[PDB]
Amino acid sequence: TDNSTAVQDSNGESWNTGLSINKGESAYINANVRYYNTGTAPMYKVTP
Amino acid sequence: NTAGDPYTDYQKASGSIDKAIKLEARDPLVAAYPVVGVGMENLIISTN
């Protein structure tokens, strides 16, 4: 006849890094532009 | 307006219309009439 008793104490830590992307809208673009006038008259409300 | 376009017989014959209209359509029998079509040149698929 045998009687046993065990006590176990455990500690742990974890680290997770992830990155996700949408393949249809992967990025957004910003174009820096300037308008030029090489004609004879001014233009108002310039809408290229 | 014999041809049924937006311009009268006198306006067409006298040329007192938009100067970008072809001279053919200065004849009262020939309609001032744009024929506009669209062509596709390529197609881009974005899988989201």
Taking CB atoms and an 8 Å cutoff, what residues of chain A touch B48?
Answer: 22-25
- Count Cα neighbours of A15 within 13 Å in the Cβ-side half-sphere: 0
Q: Is residue B1 a contact partner of residue B7, using CB atoms and an 8 Å limit?
A: yes
* Chain A residue with the nearest C-alpha to that of B47: A24
Contacts of B44 in chain A (CB under 8 A): none
Residues in chain B, how many?
48
Show the 3-state SS of chain A: CCCCCCCCCCCCCCCCCCCCCCCCCCCCCCCCCCCCCCCCCCCCCCCC
The residues, ordered by sequence, that sit 6+ positions from B16 with a Cβ below 8 Å of its Cβ are B10
A25/B47 touch (CB, cutoff 8 Å), yes or no = no
Q: What is the 3-state secondary structure (H, E, C) of chain B?
A: CCCCCCCCHHHHHHCCCCCCCCHHHHCCCCCCCCCCCCCCCCCCCCCC
**Contact in structure between B12 and B27 (CB atoms under 8 Å):** yes
Which amino acid is residue B2, in one-letter code? Answer: T
Q: Give the whole-angstrom CA distance, residue B7 versus residue B15.
A: 10
